[PDB]
């Protein structure tokens, strides 16, 4: 099933070096590259969602990120993967990116936020293709044999290769408190929170509208938003949810390894 | 022009005459681009590739675009025991030095 | 102590005679006071004067 | 050409968790003691320790 | 020195669009790194994100664009927001008078200075 | 990241007494700075840190720390001060501001 997208989003995830040399949260975190086409072509996996919007609809032109808590738009026409140098995207479809690259010992993957800023996540990656057949050759002539080789083909087909979806954790933010003198309130922008106090607090729990904890300290005082109606890829580098895992869901992943001449 | 703190613009010296340009249009290269990563008056910060060559560059308000290259082997040194390329997700610290991106005299 | 010269009469180095509007009241001129002295440690406190403006609106 | 399969990390607040151990191709777990993720807006557990 | 003004308050109804109000001054001219927080009653601060520093393209912070959807202005010390289609939940005070705020990820970093702060006009949002 | 935690949520003093001020983050990098609100009164700067300082208010002020926490202190508390003392480090990538500190001199 291809329109699976309505039911899962976007999210921010800790990338190594954004650009800049330091490590932060970021919408363009990349979880996993893959480089089985013997053709050289790479599989990429990104947590932005590509060729879908907000008011869930495919839409070629168009990407969402995570901004924060709520899913986000912007243009396909600026995302970018560059490895040494740039590479040509053959393909973008929910969170997999393909792209034909040139040699290089990194991968950079980034787009421009809808704010106008740009935004980047770089992995170490050494993208060395194997060579096909007894010649080191660096792009196809226009005359020449043909070898077999393999590829990720550019279809967003039911492919049979499968990726598990599974329900955020509880996500927390420092922004849903205020200690308003003697007291922490609870506040609500209409997501519904869960929360957590120590200061006597016998009531700890649930809420879907702004509450006050009475005697709290805001050191002592903990909350995070809950009741997620999207599901994301249960990736590393998010917390599960639950210790038995969590109730789970699919995703066929697009592009596959057709076997082809070179 | 008119000594204003616009960290959107630059000034570059037009024959005679101070005139403005884009901030957004800077850009420094050197086998590859770089990452500006600070600026202010005559001065650039700058995360760049290895390469034999350096050049600074701006689109001038008349939308031509002027550069200056010179030769400037950079390949910077390792740090620690590995030749790695950008840091990883996991790893050790080890002491090193850095232009700081604060503008502090 | 340290102190700063008018090219002739000296004060100390909080800032110069013409007083903050100095490049627009003396425009120029401000800069040769730290021509024919800039050894001095205080020097960088008559160009942190010299260099400031008090328009109307100021009030600090 | 193996893929290596790694779920989310459950990071338990306040406690103690344990390996529930099952046989898979080259199957481990470990638990990592005294962690405090944050995620983009906040630490995720409560406490520090 | 930098010094910063604003309109009092502003009485304003729910769902309209809005300008509120700067200019800036005090030893600049002109502008210089101008930015907002704002404020509603009981909360802790928060940079009003639409306005890091505009004053040569509107910001927005990760978050922001629900109903605090908004431009600002780059204008010589003119610093305006257009607050666009606001909820009751938006009444607070806008601090315009406020700090060179230095940016990232936009590659480009700031002074420290004198720094600079004020007056928060209260959007009163009131029928 | 960084997630800037001010230790201290509240404090009462004598006036004559002296306060300090703590805050704790994962790194810091460019300079954070304190900033106070009286109930219904407007800001202004205590001091900027990270490695360099400045600080506005003619000198009662003074502000440190590194290797793990950032830090300032009032010297000799006595008239109107009196307010919630917050610290910050602006937009950028996503890490938000301080949570504030209530102080003020004894009634």
């Known amino acids: 099933n291809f329109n699976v997208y309505k039911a899962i989003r976007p999210y921010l995830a800790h990338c190594p070096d954004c650009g800049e040399g330091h490590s932060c949260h970021s919408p363009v975190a990349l979880e996993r590259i893959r480089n089985e086409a013997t053709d050289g072509t790479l599989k990429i996996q990104v947590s932005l969602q590509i060729g879908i919007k907000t008011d869930d609809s495919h839409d070629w032109t168009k990407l969402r990120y995570m901004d924060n808590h709520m899913p986000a738009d912007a243009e396909r026409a600026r995302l970018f993967v560059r490895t040494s140098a740039p590479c040509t995207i053959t393909g973008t479809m929910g969170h997999f990116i393909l792209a034909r690259c040139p040699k290089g010992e990194t991968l950079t993957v980034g787009f421009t936020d809808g704010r106008k800023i740009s935004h980047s996540c770089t992995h170490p990656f050494h993208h060395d293709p194997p060579v096909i057949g007894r010649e080191k050759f660096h792009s196809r002539p226009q005359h020449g044999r043909e070898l077999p080789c393999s590829t990720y083909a550019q279809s967003t087909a039911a492919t049979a290769e499968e990726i598990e979806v599974h329900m955020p954790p509880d996500t927390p933010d420092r922004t849903l408190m205020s200690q308003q003198s003697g007291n922490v309130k609870i506040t609500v922008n209409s997501q519904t929170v869960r929360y957590k106090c120590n200061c006597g607090d016998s009531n700890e729990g649930l809420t879907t509208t702004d509450k006050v904890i009475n005697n709290c300290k805001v050191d002592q005082c903990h909350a995070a938003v809950t009741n997620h109606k999207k599901w994301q890829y249960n990736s590393p580098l998010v917390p599960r949810n639950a210790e038995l895992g969590d109730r789970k869901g699919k995703v066929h992943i697009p592009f596959p390894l057709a076997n082809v001449t070179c | 022009t008119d000594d204003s703190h616009d960290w959107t613009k630059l000034r570059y010296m037009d024959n005679h005459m101070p005139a403005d340009a884009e901030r957004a249009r800077l850009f420094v290269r050197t086998s590859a681009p770089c990452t500006i990563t600070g600026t202010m008056g005559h001065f650039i910060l700058a995360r760049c590739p290895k390469g034999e060559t350096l050049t600074v560059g701006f689109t001038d308000g008349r939308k031509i675009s002027h550069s200056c290259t010179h030769p400037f082997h950079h390949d910077p040194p390792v740090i620690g025991r590995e030749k790695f390329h950008s840091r990883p997700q996991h790893g050790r610290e080890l002491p090193c030095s850095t232009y700081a991106q604060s503008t502090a005299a | 102590p340290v102190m700063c010269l008018l090219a002739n009469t000296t004060f100390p180095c909080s800032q110069p005679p013409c007083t903050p509007c100095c490049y627009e009241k003396e425009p120029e001129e401000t800069l040769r006071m730290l021509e024919d002295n800039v050894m001095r440690p205080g020097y960088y406190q008559l160009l942190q004067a010299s260099l400031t403006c008090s328009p109307h609106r100021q009030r600090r | 050409e193996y893929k290596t399969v790694i779920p989310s990390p459950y990071v338990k607040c306040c406690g103690t968790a344990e390996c529930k151990d099952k046989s898979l191709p080259d199957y481990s777990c470990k638990v990592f003691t005294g962690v405090y993720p944050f995620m983009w807006g906040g630490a995720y557990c409560f406490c520090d320790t | 020195e930098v010094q910063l003004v604003q309109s009092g308050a502003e009485v304003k109804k729910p769902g309209s669009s809005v300008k509120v109000s700067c200019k800036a001054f005090?030893?600049?001219?002109?502008?210089?790194?101008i930015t907002w927080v704002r404020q509603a009653p009981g909360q802790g601060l928060e940079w009003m994100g639409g306005?890091?520093?505009?004053?040569?393209?509107?910001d927005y912070a990760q978050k922001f664009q629900g109903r605090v959807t908004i431009t600002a202005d780059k204008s010589t010390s003119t610093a305006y927001m257009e607050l666009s289609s606001l909820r009751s939940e938006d009444t607070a005070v806008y601090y315009c008078?406020?700090?060179?705020?230095?940016?990232?990820?936009?590659?480009?970093?700031?002074?420290?200075?004198?720094?600079?702060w004020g007056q928060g006009t209260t959007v009163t949002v009131s029928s | 990241e960084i997630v800037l935690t001010q230790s201290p949520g509240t404090l009462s003093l004598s006036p004559g007494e002296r306060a300090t001020l703590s805050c704790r983050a994962s790194?810091?990098?460019?300079?954070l700075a304190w900033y106070q609100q009286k109930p219904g009164q407007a800001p202004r700067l205590l001091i900027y840190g990270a490695s360099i300082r400045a600080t506005g208010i003619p000198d009662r002020f003074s502000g440190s720390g590194s290797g793990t926490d950032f830090t300032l202190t009032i010297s000799r508390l006595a008239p109107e001060d009196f307010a919630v003392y917050y610290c910050?480090?602006?937009?950028?990538?996503?890490?938000?501001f301080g949570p504030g500190t209530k102080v003020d001199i004894k009634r």
């Open positions: 910050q480090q602006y937009g950028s990538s996503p890490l938000t």
């Open positions: 306005i890091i520093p505009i004053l040569g393209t509107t």
């Open positions: 005090g030893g600049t001219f002109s502008s210089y790194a």
């Open positions: 790194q810091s990098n460019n300079y």
């Open positions: 008078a406020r700090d060179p705020p230095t940016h990232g990820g936009d590659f480009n970093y700031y002074y420290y200075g004198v720094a600079v």
